[PDB]
């Protein structure tokens, strides 16, 4: 539990509860949409669109099967969509700590806008445009 709270420089303790509720909604959506006859194109089409939008959200960066929806969607996946982890893994800063130290005091820029929030999220297609000021 608090392993996740300490790995990714979470400024709070509430954020693990919130992302736990969102991932719970995704799992119960997966189970309810799972229990249909598998030739019903309702199930195929809606699980397909759920796959494609979860491609775009960067959570399932891995190209996926259906059964990954039970398997990989955790809190830590969406926590790896937080800004300084994108910053570190894009090899700008040196630690996650120092990335959060830079976003606390305004040197980081996504697009044309200043950022000062350590809970802004990035897509799989907005992270091309990250620079400094």
């Amino acid at each position: 539990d608090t392993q996740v709270m300490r790995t990714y420089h979470i400024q709070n303790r509430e954020d693990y509860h919130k992302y736990n509720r969102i991932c719970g909604d995704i799992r119960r959506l997966a189970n309810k949409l799972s229990l249909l006859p598998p030739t019903d194109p309702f199930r195929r089409k809606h699980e397909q669109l759920l796959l494609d939008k979860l491609y775009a959200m960067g959570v399932l960066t891995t190209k996926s099967k259906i059964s990954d929806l039970e398997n990989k969607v955790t809190v830590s996946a969406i926590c790896r969509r937080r800004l300084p982890v994108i910053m570190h893994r894009l090899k700008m800063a040196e630690t996650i700590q120092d990335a959060v130290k830079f976003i606390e005091q305004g040197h980081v820029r996504v697009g044309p806008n200043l950022i000062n929030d350590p809970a802004y999220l990035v897509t799989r297609n907005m992270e091309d445009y990250v620079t400094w000021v």
């Binding site: 949409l33 249909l36 019903d40 759920l50 939008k53």
Partner: peptide, 26 residues
């Protein structure tokens, strides 16, 4: 039955699109 299941699943899908869309541009 089947139409009911399409009703509640289309409901939660419509809600879930909204909840991810809040995080989509913020």
């Amino acid at each position: 039955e089947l139409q009911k299941a399409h009703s509640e699943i289309s409901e939660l899908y419509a809600n879930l699109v909204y909840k991810l869309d809040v995080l989509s541009s913020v």
